[PDB]
Amino acid sequence: WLGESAVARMTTRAQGLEELYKLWGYRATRIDTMCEQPSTSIFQCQVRQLNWQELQQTPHPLLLTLQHEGQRAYVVLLEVDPERVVLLTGEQRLTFTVSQLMSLWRGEVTDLWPMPLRETLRLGMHGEAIEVLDQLLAKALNDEPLKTTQFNAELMQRVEWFQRWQAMTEDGIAGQRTLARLQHMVSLSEPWRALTQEEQVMRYPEFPSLAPLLRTYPLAET
């Protein structure tokens, strides 16, 4: 595996995704780690091809596919900067330089993120989905939520402010492009940040007790 056989511990995507779900605090089933659509919980799972510039911009951990002379292996990327990536193998925390990463990674990632909002939300609608919209927008904008259950005129102005920041049409409707960007960037909880930032209260590869996945979506009504 060039010189680093430790990185290549997890040999299937399902094994890697089981580990990636633990970073989010969840115990995943065999169905969840198939990464097939439709989703079986509020999480989205997508395989994508990234370049290194794109990988550096990831807003949350990813599963990297490593390839070496006809073999595949899978490792969790926990954090990344221009010089180094921090990898989780299911047994060890490793740091790789850019050179080490590029010798083994050919672009493929599998990305998991929570996406509880999967239907268009617009002015006049109300319900738990609107409260969740309100909370995610405050998190993305780094400011305060309205504490509203109603998609009102002021929430609409906040959708537009997010839309303009993200270079998307500023129609004030939280439709597919707007909710997909919002929920890939931020989540209601990000337990994985506990592993990023002496010595450690919970040392990897140990995890605290995991929760079952959330398998209901918040509703909204017209």
Side-chain angles (χ1 to χ4, degrees), residues 47-83:
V47 174
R48 279 212 306 298
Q49 280 284 323
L50 276 41
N51 59 44
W52 170 230
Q53 173 76 348
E54 291 164 338
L55 186 70
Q56 287 170 259
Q57 306 288 33
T58 189
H60 41 74
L62 293 177
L63 184 72
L64 302 185
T65 301
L66 303 188
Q67 340 210 2
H68 179 67
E69 62 176 81
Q71 307 230 91
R72 292 151 67 91
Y74 294 88
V75 69
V76 169
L77 173 70
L78 175 68
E79 55 187 303
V80 52
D81 72 27
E83 292 177 336

PDB file of all heavy atoms in Angstrom, residues 47-83:
ATOM      1  N   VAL A  47     -21.915   9.147  -3.467  1.00  0.00           N
ATOM      2  CA  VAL A  47     -20.530   8.957  -3.954  1.00  0.00           C
ATOM      3  C   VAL A  47     -20.249  10.100  -4.928  1.00  0.00           C
ATOM      4  O   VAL A  47     -21.133  10.498  -5.746  1.00  0.00           O
ATOM      5  CB  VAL A  47     -20.410   7.607  -4.639  1.00  0.00           C
ATOM      6  CG1 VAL A  47     -19.021   7.479  -5.271  1.00  0.00           C
ATOM      7  CG2 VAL A  47     -20.598   6.405  -3.659  1.00  0.00           C
ATOM      8  N   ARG A  48     -19.093  10.770  -4.803  1.00  0.00           N
ATOM      9  CA  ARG A  48     -18.795  11.910  -5.705  1.00  0.00           C
ATOM     10  C   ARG A  48     -17.320  11.769  -6.042  1.00  0.00           C
ATOM     11  O   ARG A  48     -16.574  11.072  -5.352  1.00  0.00           O
ATOM     12  CB  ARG A  48     -18.966  13.239  -4.963  1.00  0.00           C
ATOM     13  CG  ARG A  48     -20.485  13.742  -4.853  1.00  0.00           C
ATOM     14  CD  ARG A  48     -20.603  15.311  -4.847  1.00  0.00           C
ATOM     15  NE  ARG A  48     -19.783  15.958  -3.799  1.00  0.00           N
ATOM     16  CZ  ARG A  48     -19.912  15.788  -2.493  1.00  0.00           C
ATOM     17  NH1 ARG A  48     -20.926  15.072  -2.025  1.00  0.00           N
ATOM     18  NH2 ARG A  48     -19.037  16.420  -1.632  1.00  0.00           N
ATOM     19  N   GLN A  49     -16.919  12.434  -7.127  1.00  0.00           N
ATOM     20  CA  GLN A  49     -15.456  12.558  -7.447  1.00  0.00           C
ATOM     21  C   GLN A  49     -15.056  13.968  -7.181  1.00  0.00           C
ATOM     22  O   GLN A  49     -15.718  14.928  -7.733  1.00  0.00           O
ATOM     23  CB  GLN A  49     -15.271  12.276  -8.936  1.00  0.00           C
ATOM     24  CG  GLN A  49     -15.272  10.875  -9.210  1.00  0.00           C
ATOM     25  CD  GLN A  49     -13.988  10.197  -8.818  1.00  0.00           C
ATOM     26  OE1 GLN A  49     -12.847  10.739  -8.944  1.00  0.00           O
ATOM     27  NE2 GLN A  49     -14.152   8.982  -8.364  1.00  0.00           N
ATOM     28  N   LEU A  50     -14.021  14.152  -6.346  1.00  0.00           N
ATOM     29  CA  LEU A  50     -13.552  15.513  -5.940  1.00  0.00           C
ATOM     30  C   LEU A  50     -12.128  15.667  -6.403  1.00  0.00           C
ATOM     31  O   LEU A  50     -11.414  14.649  -6.512  1.00  0.00           O
ATOM     32  CB  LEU A  50     -13.543  15.733  -4.431  1.00  0.00           C
ATOM     33  CG  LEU A  50     -14.851  16.168  -3.779  1.00  0.00           C
ATOM     34  CD1 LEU A  50     -16.036  15.453  -4.312  1.00  0.00           C
ATOM     35  CD2 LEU A  50     -14.815  16.146  -2.247  1.00  0.00           C
ATOM     36  N   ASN A  51     -11.694  16.917  -6.544  1.00  0.00           N
ATOM     37  CA  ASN A  51     -10.225  17.188  -6.667  1.00  0.00           C
ATOM     38  C   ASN A  51      -9.747  17.660  -5.292  1.00  0.00           C
ATOM     39  O   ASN A  51     -10.530  17.750  -4.286  1.00  0.00           O
ATOM     40  CB  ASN A  51      -9.919  18.144  -7.802  1.00  0.00           C
ATOM     41  CG  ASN A  51     -10.614  19.504  -7.631  1.00  0.00           C
ATOM     42  OD1 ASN A  51     -10.606  20.044  -6.527  1.00  0.00           O
ATOM     43  ND2 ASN A  51     -11.218  20.048  -8.688  1.00  0.00           N
ATOM     44  N   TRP A  52      -8.446  17.923  -5.141  1.00  0.00           N
ATOM     45  CA  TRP A  52      -7.892  18.267  -3.855  1.00  0.00           C
ATOM     46  C   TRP A  52      -8.354  19.621  -3.359  1.00  0.00           C
ATOM     47  O   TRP A  52      -8.548  19.790  -2.135  1.00  0.00           O
ATOM     48  CB  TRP A  52      -6.324  18.265  -4.024  1.00  0.00           C
ATOM     49  CG  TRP A  52      -5.561  18.815  -2.907  1.00  0.00           C
ATOM     50  CD1 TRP A  52      -4.572  19.763  -3.020  1.00  0.00           C
ATOM     51  CD2 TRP A  52      -5.577  18.443  -1.476  1.00  0.00           C
ATOM     52  NE1 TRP A  52      -3.979  20.012  -1.797  1.00  0.00           N
ATOM     53  CE2 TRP A  52      -4.567  19.229  -0.833  1.00  0.00           C
ATOM     54  CE3 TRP A  52      -6.330  17.539  -0.702  1.00  0.00           C
ATOM     55  CZ2 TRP A  52      -4.304  19.155   0.547  1.00  0.00           C
ATOM     56  CZ3 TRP A  52      -6.063  17.462   0.672  1.00  0.00           C
ATOM     57  CH2 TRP A  52      -5.046  18.237   1.272  1.00  0.00           C
ATOM     58  N   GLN A  53      -8.527  20.584  -4.284  1.00  0.00           N
ATOM     59  CA  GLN A  53      -9.066  21.922  -3.930  1.00  0.00           C
ATOM     60  C   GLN A  53     -10.458  21.690  -3.301  1.00  0.00           C
ATOM     61  O   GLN A  53     -10.758  22.200  -2.205  1.00  0.00           O
ATOM     62  CB  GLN A  53      -9.147  22.840  -5.174  1.00  0.00           C
ATOM     63  CG  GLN A  53      -9.859  24.146  -4.838  1.00  0.00           C
ATOM     64  CD  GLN A  53      -9.060  25.197  -4.028  1.00  0.00           C
ATOM     65  OE1 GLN A  53      -7.965  24.928  -3.455  1.00  0.00           O
ATOM     66  NE2 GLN A  53      -9.635  26.436  -3.959  1.00  0.00           N
ATOM     67  N   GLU A  54     -11.272  20.842  -3.932  1.00  0.00           N
ATOM     68  CA  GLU A  54     -12.645  20.607  -3.422  1.00  0.00           C
ATOM     69  C   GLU A  54     -12.613  19.861  -2.078  1.00  0.00           C
ATOM     70  O   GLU A  54     -13.387  20.217  -1.154  1.00  0.00           O
ATOM     71  CB  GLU A  54     -13.485  19.858  -4.452  1.00  0.00           C
ATOM     72  CG  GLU A  54     -13.818  20.677  -5.667  1.00  0.00           C
ATOM     73  CD  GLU A  54     -14.305  19.864  -6.871  1.00  0.00           C
ATOM     74  OE1 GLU A  54     -14.035  18.644  -6.990  1.00  0.00           O
ATOM     75  OE2 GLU A  54     -14.986  20.490  -7.737  1.00  0.00           O
ATOM     76  N   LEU A  55     -11.706  18.900  -1.905  1.00  0.00           N
ATOM     77  CA  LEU A  55     -11.676  18.128  -0.707  1.00  0.00           C
ATOM     78  C   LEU A  55     -11.351  19.078   0.451  1.00  0.00           C
ATOM     79  O   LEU A  55     -11.936  19.004   1.531  1.00  0.00           O
ATOM     80  CB  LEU A  55     -10.567  17.051  -0.851  1.00  0.00           C
ATOM     81  CG  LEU A  55     -10.557  16.080   0.349  1.00  0.00           C
ATOM     82  CD1 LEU A  55     -11.839  15.218   0.227  1.00  0.00           C
ATOM     83  CD2 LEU A  55      -9.359  15.168   0.301  1.00  0.00           C
ATOM     84  N   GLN A  56     -10.466  20.026   0.232  1.00  0.00           N
ATOM     85  CA  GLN A  56     -10.119  20.966   1.301  1.00  0.00           C
ATOM     86  C   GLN A  56     -11.280  21.794   1.773  1.00  0.00           C
ATOM     87  O   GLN A  56     -11.206  22.278   2.940  1.00  0.00           O
ATOM     88  CB  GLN A  56      -9.018  21.941   0.824  1.00  0.00           C
ATOM     89  CG  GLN A  56      -7.662  21.233   0.742  1.00  0.00           C
ATOM     90  CD  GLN A  56      -6.642  22.137   0.038  1.00  0.00           C
ATOM     91  OE1 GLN A  56      -6.313  21.990  -1.191  1.00  0.00           O
ATOM     92  NE2 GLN A  56      -6.156  23.101   0.793  1.00  0.00           N
ATOM     93  N   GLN A  57     -12.335  21.958   0.955  1.00  0.00           N
ATOM     94  CA  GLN A  57     -13.473  22.792   1.331  1.00  0.00           C
ATOM     95  C   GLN A  57     -14.546  22.004   2.042  1.00  0.00           C
ATOM     96  O   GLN A  57     -15.629  22.545   2.303  1.00  0.00           O
ATOM     97  CB  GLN A  57     -14.081  23.412   0.060  1.00  0.00           C
ATOM     98  CG  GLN A  57     -13.098  24.179  -0.819  1.00  0.00           C
ATOM     99  CD  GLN A  57     -12.684  25.485  -0.223  1.00  0.00           C
ATOM    100  OE1 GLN A  57     -12.584  25.640   1.014  1.00  0.00           O
ATOM    101  NE2 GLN A  57     -12.425  26.471  -1.097  1.00  0.00           N
ATOM    102  N   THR A  58     -14.291  20.720   2.271  1.00  0.00           N
ATOM    103  CA  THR A  58     -15.460  19.932   2.856  1.00  0.00           C
ATOM    104  C   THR A  58     -15.915  20.486   4.192  1.00  0.00           C
ATOM    105  O   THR A  58     -15.062  20.701   5.086  1.00  0.00           O
ATOM    106  CB  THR A  58     -15.176  18.441   2.934  1.00  0.00           C
ATOM    107  OG1 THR A  58     -16.388  17.748   3.280  1.00  0.00           O
ATOM    108  CG2 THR A  58     -14.093  18.085   3.916  1.00  0.00           C
ATOM    109  N   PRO A  59     -17.238  20.601   4.303  1.00  0.00           N
ATOM    110  CA  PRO A  59     -17.759  21.175   5.576  1.00  0.00           C
ATOM    111  C   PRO A  59     -17.914  20.094   6.676  1.00  0.00           C
ATOM    112  O   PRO A  59     -18.273  20.457   7.845  1.00  0.00           O
ATOM    113  CB  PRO A  59     -19.139  21.749   5.159  1.00  0.00           C
ATOM    114  CG  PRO A  59     -19.549  20.863   4.030  1.00  0.00           C
ATOM    115  CD  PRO A  59     -18.294  20.573   3.249  1.00  0.00           C
ATOM    116  N   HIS A  60     -17.678  18.793   6.384  1.00  0.00           N
ATOM    117  CA  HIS A  60     -17.827  17.758   7.421  1.00  0.00           C
ATOM    118  C   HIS A  60     -17.018  16.561   6.951  1.00  0.00           C
ATOM    119  O   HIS A  60     -16.459  16.518   5.824  1.00  0.00           O
ATOM    120  CB  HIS A  60     -19.324  17.332   7.537  1.00  0.00           C
ATOM    121  CG  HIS A  60     -20.034  17.198   6.208  1.00  0.00           C
ATOM    122  ND1 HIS A  60     -19.867  16.168   5.309  1.00  0.00           N
ATOM    123  CD2 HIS A  60     -21.027  17.982   5.717  1.00  0.00           C
ATOM    124  CE1 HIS A  60     -20.688  16.334   4.274  1.00  0.00           C
ATOM    125  NE2 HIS A  60     -21.382  17.453   4.474  1.00  0.00           N
ATOM    126  N   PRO A  61     -16.840  15.577   7.790  1.00  0.00           N
ATOM    127  CA  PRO A  61     -16.011  14.431   7.462  1.00  0.00           C
ATOM    128  C   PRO A  61     -16.586  13.669   6.250  1.00  0.00           C
ATOM    129  O   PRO A  61     -17.781  13.734   5.936  1.00  0.00           O
ATOM    130  CB  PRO A  61     -16.044  13.565   8.745  1.00  0.00           C
ATOM    131  CG  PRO A  61     -16.228  14.621   9.830  1.00  0.00           C
ATOM    132  CD  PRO A  61     -17.215  15.643   9.219  1.00  0.00           C
ATOM    133  N   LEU A  62     -15.686  12.958   5.556  1.00  0.00           N
ATOM    134  CA  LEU A  62     -16.020  12.165   4.356  1.00  0.00           C
ATOM    135  C   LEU A  62     -15.359  10.841   4.444  1.00  0.00           C
ATOM    136  O   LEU A  62     -14.346  10.647   5.231  1.00  0.00           O
ATOM    137  CB  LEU A  62     -15.385  12.876   3.082  1.00  0.00           C
ATOM    138  CG  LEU A  62     -16.027  14.221   2.769  1.00  0.00           C
ATOM    139  CD1 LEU A  62     -15.302  14.836   1.596  1.00  0.00           C
ATOM    140  CD2 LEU A  62     -17.492  14.131   2.368  1.00  0.00           C
ATOM    141  N   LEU A  63     -15.817   9.860   3.620  1.00  0.00           N
ATOM    142  CA  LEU A  63     -15.082   8.565   3.506  1.00  0.00           C
ATOM    143  C   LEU A  63     -14.268   8.610   2.192  1.00  0.00           C
ATOM    144  O   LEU A  63     -14.880   8.913   1.127  1.00  0.00           O
ATOM    145  CB  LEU A  63     -16.085   7.408   3.454  1.00  0.00           C
ATOM    146  CG  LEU A  63     -15.414   5.998   3.438  1.00  0.00           C
ATOM    147  CD1 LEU A  63     -14.811   5.676   4.865  1.00  0.00           C
ATOM    148  CD2 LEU A  63     -16.538   4.979   3.099  1.00  0.00           C
ATOM    149  N   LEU A  64     -12.942   8.410   2.299  1.00  0.00           N
ATOM    150  CA  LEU A  64     -12.094   8.490   1.097  1.00  0.00           C
ATOM    151  C   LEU A  64     -11.943   7.059   0.567  1.00  0.00           C
ATOM    152  O   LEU A  64     -11.686   6.123   1.321  1.00  0.00           O
ATOM    153  CB  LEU A  64     -10.684   9.017   1.438  1.00  0.00           C
ATOM    154  CG  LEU A  64     -10.692  10.392   2.102  1.00  0.00           C
ATOM    155  CD1 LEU A  64      -9.212  10.804   2.238  1.00  0.00           C
ATOM    156  CD2 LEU A  64     -11.492  11.403   1.305  1.00  0.00           C
ATOM    157  N   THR A  65     -12.029   6.864  -0.746  1.00  0.00           N
ATOM    158  CA  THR A  65     -11.690   5.583  -1.365  1.00  0.00           C
ATOM    159  C   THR A  65     -10.221   5.659  -1.696  1.00  0.00           C
ATOM    160  O   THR A  65      -9.796   6.543  -2.515  1.00  0.00           O
ATOM    161  CB  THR A  65     -12.541   5.350  -2.649  1.00  0.00           C
ATOM    162  OG1 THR A  65     -13.963   5.361  -2.326  1.00  0.00           O
ATOM    163  CG2 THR A  65     -12.192   3.948  -3.288  1.00  0.00           C
ATOM    164  N   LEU A  66      -9.449   4.694  -1.186  1.00  0.00           N
ATOM    165  CA  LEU A  66      -8.008   4.609  -1.546  1.00  0.00           C
ATOM    166  C   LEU A  66      -7.837   3.466  -2.566  1.00  0.00           C
ATOM    167  O   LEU A  66      -8.551   2.453  -2.503  1.00  0.00           O
ATOM    168  CB  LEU A  66      -7.179   4.386  -0.299  1.00  0.00           C
ATOM    169  CG  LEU A  66      -7.335   5.454   0.820  1.00  0.00           C
ATOM    170  CD1 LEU A  66      -6.288   5.189   1.934  1.00  0.00           C
ATOM    171  CD2 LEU A  66      -7.191   6.849   0.246  1.00  0.00           C
ATOM    172  N   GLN A  67      -6.949   3.653  -3.545  1.00  0.00           N
ATOM    173  CA  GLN A  67      -6.785   2.630  -4.589  1.00  0.00           C
ATOM    174  C   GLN A  67      -5.273   2.414  -4.694  1.00  0.00           C
ATOM    175  O   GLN A  67      -4.506   3.377  -4.640  1.00  0.00           O
ATOM    176  CB  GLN A  67      -7.472   3.005  -5.961  1.00  0.00           C
ATOM    177  CG  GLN A  67      -8.617   4.127  -5.878  1.00  0.00           C
ATOM    178  CD  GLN A  67      -9.813   4.104  -6.914  1.00  0.00           C
ATOM    179  OE1 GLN A  67      -9.903   3.204  -7.784  1.00  0.00           O
ATOM    180  NE2 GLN A  67     -10.759   5.122  -6.784  1.00  0.00           N
ATOM    181  N   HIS A  68      -4.852   1.144  -4.721  1.00  0.00           N
ATOM    182  CA  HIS A  68      -3.430   0.805  -4.921  1.00  0.00           C
ATOM    183  C   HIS A  68      -3.332  -0.533  -5.617  1.00  0.00           C
ATOM    184  O   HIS A  68      -3.719  -1.586  -5.074  1.00  0.00           O
ATOM    185  CB  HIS A  68      -2.612   0.806  -3.629  1.00  0.00           C
ATOM    186  CG  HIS A  68      -1.173   0.441  -3.832  1.00  0.00           C
ATOM    187  ND1 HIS A  68      -0.293   1.251  -4.526  1.00  0.00           N
ATOM    188  CD2 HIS A  68      -0.468  -0.654  -3.448  1.00  0.00           C
ATOM    189  CE1 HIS A  68       0.895   0.666  -4.560  1.00  0.00           C
ATOM    190  NE2 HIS A  68       0.818  -0.484  -3.905  1.00  0.00           N
ATOM    191  N   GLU A  69      -2.766  -0.449  -6.833  1.00  0.00           N
ATOM    192  CA  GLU A  69      -2.631  -1.564  -7.747  1.00  0.00           C
ATOM    193  C   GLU A  69      -3.770  -2.613  -7.703  1.00  0.00           C
ATOM    194  O   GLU A  69      -3.555  -3.791  -7.359  1.00  0.00           O
ATOM    195  CB  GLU A  69      -1.203  -2.138  -7.663  1.00  0.00           C
ATOM    196  CG  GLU A  69      -0.748  -2.711  -6.323  1.00  0.00           C
ATOM    197  CD  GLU A  69       0.646  -3.322  -6.413  1.00  0.00           C
ATOM    198  OE1 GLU A  69       1.658  -2.557  -6.344  1.00  0.00           O
ATOM    199  OE2 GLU A  69       0.731  -4.567  -6.600  1.00  0.00           O
ATOM    200  N   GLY A  70      -4.982  -2.164  -8.067  1.00  0.00           N
ATOM    201  CA  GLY A  70      -6.142  -3.052  -8.190  1.00  0.00           C
ATOM    202  C   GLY A  70      -6.837  -3.362  -6.881  1.00  0.00           C
ATOM    203  O   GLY A  70      -7.841  -4.093  -6.859  1.00  0.00           O
ATOM    204  N   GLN A  71      -6.324  -2.826  -5.783  1.00  0.00           N
ATOM    205  CA  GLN A  71      -7.013  -2.984  -4.490  1.00  0.00           C
ATOM    206  C   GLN A  71      -7.724  -1.691  -4.087  1.00  0.00           C
ATOM    207  O   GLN A  71      -7.260  -0.598  -4.468  1.00  0.00           O
ATOM    208  CB  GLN A  71      -6.017  -3.359  -3.405  1.00  0.00           C
ATOM    209  CG  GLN A  71      -5.190  -4.552  -3.781  1.00  0.00           C
ATOM    210  CD  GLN A  71      -5.212  -5.555  -2.680  1.00  0.00           C
ATOM    211  OE1 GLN A  71      -6.068  -6.446  -2.658  1.00  0.00           O
ATOM    212  NE2 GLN A  71      -4.308  -5.390  -1.714  1.00  0.00           N
ATOM    213  N   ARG A  72      -8.852  -1.830  -3.372  1.00  0.00           N
ATOM    214  CA  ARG A  72      -9.507  -0.638  -2.753  1.00  0.00           C
ATOM    215  C   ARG A  72      -9.530  -0.761  -1.231  1.00  0.00           C
ATOM    216  O   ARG A  72      -9.586  -1.874  -0.663  1.00  0.00           O
ATOM    217  CB  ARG A  72     -10.948  -0.368  -3.279  1.00  0.00           C
ATOM    218  CG  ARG A  72     -10.960   0.066  -4.762  1.00  0.00           C
ATOM    219  CD  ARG A  72     -12.233  -0.339  -5.474  1.00  0.00           C
ATOM    220  NE  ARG A  72     -13.366   0.393  -4.930  1.00  0.00           N
ATOM    221  CZ  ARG A  72     -13.830   1.569  -5.377  1.00  0.00           C
ATOM    222  NH1 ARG A  72     -13.262   2.171  -6.431  1.00  0.00           N
ATOM    223  NH2 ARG A  72     -14.891   2.136  -4.751  1.00  0.00           N
ATOM    224  N   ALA A  73      -9.506   0.382  -0.582  1.00  0.00           N
ATOM    225  CA  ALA A  73      -9.660   0.490   0.859  1.00  0.00           C
ATOM    226  C   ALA A  73     -10.291   1.818   1.142  1.00  0.00           C
ATOM    227  O   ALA A  73     -10.464   2.672   0.222  1.00  0.00           O
ATOM    228  CB  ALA A  73      -8.332   0.397   1.593  1.00  0.00           C
ATOM    229  N   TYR A  74     -10.771   1.987   2.365  1.00  0.00           N
ATOM    230  CA  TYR A  74     -11.668   3.132   2.655  1.00  0.00           C
ATOM    231  C   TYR A  74     -11.200   3.697   4.003  1.00  0.00           C
ATOM    232  O   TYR A  74     -10.958   2.953   4.912  1.00  0.00           O
ATOM    233  CB  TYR A  74     -13.139   2.631   2.796  1.00  0.00           C
ATOM    234  CG  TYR A  74     -13.646   2.103   1.481  1.00  0.00           C
ATOM    235  CD1 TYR A  74     -13.456   0.750   1.113  1.00  0.00           C
ATOM    236  CD2 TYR A  74     -14.262   2.986   0.566  1.00  0.00           C
ATOM    237  CE1 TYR A  74     -13.864   0.305  -0.123  1.00  0.00           C
ATOM    238  CE2 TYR A  74     -14.718   2.540  -0.705  1.00  0.00           C
ATOM    239  CZ  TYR A  74     -14.520   1.178  -1.034  1.00  0.00           C
ATOM    240  OH  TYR A  74     -14.923   0.666  -2.230  1.00  0.00           O
ATOM    241  N   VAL A  75     -11.080   5.023   4.098  1.00  0.00           N
ATOM    242  CA  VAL A  75     -10.617   5.643   5.346  1.00  0.00           C
ATOM    243  C   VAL A  75     -11.435   6.929   5.582  1.00  0.00           C
ATOM    244  O   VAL A  75     -11.901   7.551   4.636  1.00  0.00           O
ATOM    245  CB  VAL A  75      -9.078   5.932   5.270  1.00  0.00           C
ATOM    246  CG1 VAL A  75      -8.730   7.054   4.249  1.00  0.00           C
ATOM    247  CG2 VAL A  75      -8.554   6.235   6.598  1.00  0.00           C
ATOM    248  N   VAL A  76     -11.733   7.224   6.841  1.00  0.00           N
ATOM    249  CA  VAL A  76     -12.462   8.440   7.154  1.00  0.00           C
ATOM    250  C   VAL A  76     -11.549   9.620   7.163  1.00  0.00           C
ATOM    251  O   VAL A  76     -10.507   9.614   7.837  1.00  0.00           O
ATOM    252  CB  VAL A  76     -13.251   8.315   8.485  1.00  0.00           C
ATOM    253  CG1 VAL A  76     -13.794   9.684   8.924  1.00  0.00           C
ATOM    254  CG2 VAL A  76     -14.389   7.275   8.297  1.00  0.00           C
ATOM    255  N   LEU A  77     -11.936  10.673   6.418  1.00  0.00           N
ATOM    256  CA  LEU A  77     -11.220  11.967   6.524  1.00  0.00           C
ATOM    257  C   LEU A  77     -11.941  12.754   7.585  1.00  0.00           C
ATOM    258  O   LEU A  77     -13.124  13.104   7.451  1.00  0.00           O
ATOM    259  CB  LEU A  77     -11.300  12.715   5.160  1.00  0.00           C
ATOM    260  CG  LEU A  77     -10.749  14.155   5.181  1.00  0.00           C
ATOM    261  CD1 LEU A  77      -9.288  14.140   5.322  1.00  0.00           C
ATOM    262  CD2 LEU A  77     -11.124  14.840   3.844  1.00  0.00           C
ATOM    263  N   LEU A  78     -11.212  13.102   8.662  1.00  0.00           N
ATOM    264  CA  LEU A  78     -11.791  13.864   9.752  1.00  0.00           C
ATOM    265  C   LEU A  78     -11.535  15.307   9.551  1.00  0.00           C
ATOM    266  O   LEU A  78     -12.465  16.113   9.823  1.00  0.00           O
ATOM    267  CB  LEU A  78     -11.175  13.381  11.140  1.00  0.00           C
ATOM    268  CG  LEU A  78     -11.574  14.147  12.384  1.00  0.00           C
ATOM    269  CD1 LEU A  78     -13.051  13.911  12.703  1.00  0.00           C
ATOM    270  CD2 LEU A  78     -10.677  13.616  13.554  1.00  0.00           C
ATOM    271  N   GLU A  79     -10.293  15.702   9.230  1.00  0.00           N
ATOM    272  CA  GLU A  79     -10.058  17.129   8.937  1.00  0.00           C
ATOM    273  C   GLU A  79      -8.965  17.266   7.897  1.00  0.00           C
ATOM    274  O   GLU A  79      -8.245  16.347   7.645  1.00  0.00           O
ATOM    275  CB  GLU A  79      -9.743  17.929  10.155  1.00  0.00           C
ATOM    276  CG  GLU A  79      -8.602  17.419  10.938  1.00  0.00           C
ATOM    277  CD  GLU A  79      -8.484  18.239  12.276  1.00  0.00           C
ATOM    278  OE1 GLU A  79      -8.352  19.487  12.168  1.00  0.00           O
ATOM    279  OE2 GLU A  79      -8.554  17.676  13.368  1.00  0.00           O
ATOM    280  N   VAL A  80      -8.875  18.452   7.347  1.00  0.00           N
ATOM    281  CA  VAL A  80      -8.001  18.663   6.193  1.00  0.00           C
ATOM    282  C   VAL A  80      -7.539  20.094   6.182  1.00  0.00           C
ATOM    283  O   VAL A  80      -8.322  21.022   6.504  1.00  0.00           O
ATOM    284  CB  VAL A  80      -8.726  18.337   4.856  1.00  0.00           C
ATOM    285  CG1 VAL A  80     -10.124  19.095   4.689  1.00  0.00           C
ATOM    286  CG2 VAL A  80      -7.785  18.656   3.657  1.00  0.00           C
ATOM    287  N   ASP A  81      -6.260  20.283   5.835  1.00  0.00           N
ATOM    288  CA  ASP A  81      -5.725  21.658   5.601  1.00  0.00           C
ATOM    289  C   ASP A  81      -4.752  21.547   4.410  1.00  0.00           C
ATOM    290  O   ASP A  81      -4.607  20.446   3.881  1.00  0.00           O
ATOM    291  CB  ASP A  81      -5.165  22.298   6.880  1.00  0.00           C
ATOM    292  CG  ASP A  81      -3.848  21.694   7.352  1.00  0.00           C
ATOM    293  OD1 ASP A  81      -3.071  21.162   6.522  1.00  0.00           O
ATOM    294  OD2 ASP A  81      -3.527  21.841   8.569  1.00  0.00           O
ATOM    295  N   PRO A  82      -4.176  22.656   3.913  1.00  0.00           N
ATOM    296  CA  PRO A  82      -3.280  22.514   2.729  1.00  0.00           C
ATOM    297  C   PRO A  82      -2.097  21.592   2.875  1.00  0.00           C
ATOM    298  O   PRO A  82      -1.550  21.148   1.844  1.00  0.00           O
ATOM    299  CB  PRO A  82      -2.750  23.942   2.537  1.00  0.00           C
ATOM    300  CG  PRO A  82      -3.914  24.751   3.009  1.00  0.00           C
ATOM    301  CD  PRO A  82      -4.468  24.072   4.193  1.00  0.00           C
ATOM    302  N   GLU A  83      -1.720  21.295   4.113  1.00  0.00           N
ATOM    303  CA  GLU A  83      -0.520  20.502   4.308  1.00  0.00           C
ATOM    304  C   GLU A  83      -0.725  19.024   4.719  1.00  0.00           C
ATOM    305  O   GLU A  83       0.187  18.191   4.499  1.00  0.00           O
ATOM    306  CB  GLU A  83       0.379  21.216   5.345  1.00  0.00           C
ATOM    307  CG  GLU A  83       0.996  22.561   4.857  1.00  0.00           C
ATOM    308  CD  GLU A  83       1.809  23.224   5.972  1.00  0.00           C
ATOM    309  OE1 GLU A  83       1.530  22.931   7.157  1.00  0.00           O
ATOM    310  OE2 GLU A  83       2.734  24.009   5.691  1.00  0.00           O
TER     311      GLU A  83
END
